[PDB]
Amino acid sequence: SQIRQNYSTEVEAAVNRLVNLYLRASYTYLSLGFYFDRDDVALEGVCHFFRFLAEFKRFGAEFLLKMQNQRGGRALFQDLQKPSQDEWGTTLDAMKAAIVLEKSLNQALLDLHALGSAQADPHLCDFLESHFLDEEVKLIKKMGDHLTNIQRLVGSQAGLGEYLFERLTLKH
Amino acid sequence: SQIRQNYSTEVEAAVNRLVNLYLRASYTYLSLGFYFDRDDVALEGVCHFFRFLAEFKRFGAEFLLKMQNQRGGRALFQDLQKPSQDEWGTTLDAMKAAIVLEKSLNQALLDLHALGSAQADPHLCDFLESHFLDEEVKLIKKMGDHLTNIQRLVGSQAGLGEYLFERLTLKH
Amino acid sequence: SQIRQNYSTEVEAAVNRLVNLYLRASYTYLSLGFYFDRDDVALEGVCHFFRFLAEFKRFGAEFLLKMQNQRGGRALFQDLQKPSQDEWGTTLDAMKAAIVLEKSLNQALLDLHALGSAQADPHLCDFLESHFLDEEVKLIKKMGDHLTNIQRLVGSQAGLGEYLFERLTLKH
């Protein structure tokens, strides 16, 4: 490449893997969103929360691909694994699965940041810091806040709590 | 001092003590606010109620300091004690602690008003009457209203009630 | 904690200590501001400079507390020591004390950045870089500029110079 400078093959490959992880996360959120749109689930705010995250993770993948080309690396796409479940249980089950997924993406971001620091690639490090690390901490905090509110609403009237959370916390 | 007139050393010292009490109350409300922002507490309206009071009590301290200088007294600052708790329990526990704190500030206002009246300091008396006494009665009434609503919502579904109070009474 | 990830106990504790340092600095600036509002000091622009810094340092403390919760750490508050002086001397004395205070806060920021780098905590490092390190360098440069102008105005007519600096450099 006529532009590539200070961009290791190790970083290039790890960026392609991170693109796959974000596209997989987007797919997981698409499945979560349409589960909550089922006529036998019918939680509009929950559907909208996860459909927004599906678009937000696709955006993250596209930002990584733009950066891959800016650095002179080569995008390489792999098969995208289907999500881990076909049915996602309750809002609580879904929000737990979402925070597990986000902690996995956050650890992948931290791992790539550590590789960039080891390879003295400050453009890679700054790119993650400026576009991903704080967005990810803020999303995980939001999901933790939601999990606590869902948990406090279960009590012995689980259906009432799940309705109220969707109506009074989530955007619909 | 070239301006000081009818301003006793007793009032000057009691004003400095009241500044300390208001700055301590502001600090207590800062701690209450950030407790309700914890991911394992997550009651946004409760966080906002106490963060507003932290700013409101700081304002009261600054108004007292402005008056101290207007009268020709000398601001003297003391160490600010940490709040009484690191964790504040439920919204009910927190709102009870807040009304105990406000009754303590109100008694300090009444004590300083009585000293000013004994020292025939009508500017001090009017300053408290016009800027503090009614604001304090109105805040205590608001907190009493909130305590009654929180208490009526406990029943046997405490988590549901605490969610509903935060969602439907407090500003978020 | 259900959200905490890559957030060491060492960083958590150092963040709480930095919150204390910023709240102490805010308190120091409150005392400086009201000293310059005394009828026997009466330098409005100097009062406003330090009152603005009192609010700016409180803001910094609140930003650290927000981040502490975003990361899943626990805010812990300590007693806030009174400022180092009750009377602050001349504008020159005050601006020297302010730059000593700011260099102490800047070294605390640099120390926490170095701890975050040692603990491979890039979110902490980016948070300080993006919200504190450049703001602090810019504030110290401004104070250095002011110290030089105050020093050039002393000559043998110190009162004239102190008036002129307040009138023609500081906002009133």
Added chain:
Amino acid sequence: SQIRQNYSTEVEAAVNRLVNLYLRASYTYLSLGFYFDRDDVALEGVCHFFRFLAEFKRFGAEFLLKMQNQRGGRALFQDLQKPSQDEWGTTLDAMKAAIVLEKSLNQALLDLHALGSAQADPHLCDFLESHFLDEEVKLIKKMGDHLTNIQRLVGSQAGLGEYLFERLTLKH
């Protein structure tokens, strides 16, 4: 009188005396204002400061007279003594004479407040508290601030300092 209620002859007479004191103060400020308009004095900002106070004290007298009639007392006017000086010296001399005058008016306000309190006349007490006592404290603080700035500007270049104070502190 068909309206008079709870309004002692002692208060009525003291209100008429206070009207005389405010009209005398207005006259003193008229003389101060026109002294600073002399071609051999020529300090426009100083002239404007004292001309504003002449109008402000006339206003205070008219507010007392309105209240005298509202209470059913009878305005009684006495001769208005000429001001204490025909020539007022420097801005410093003038601002010292002004603070002596204002402390005398403030003590008269405090004396009438104490008489009203002794006579259980709360309308009189509230009238002074709401319209006079804080305005007077604020004016005396402003004059003290000005005296300190004038004093710091004397040094060994008195004419330079007096020019600069008029140009850079007073409104012209």
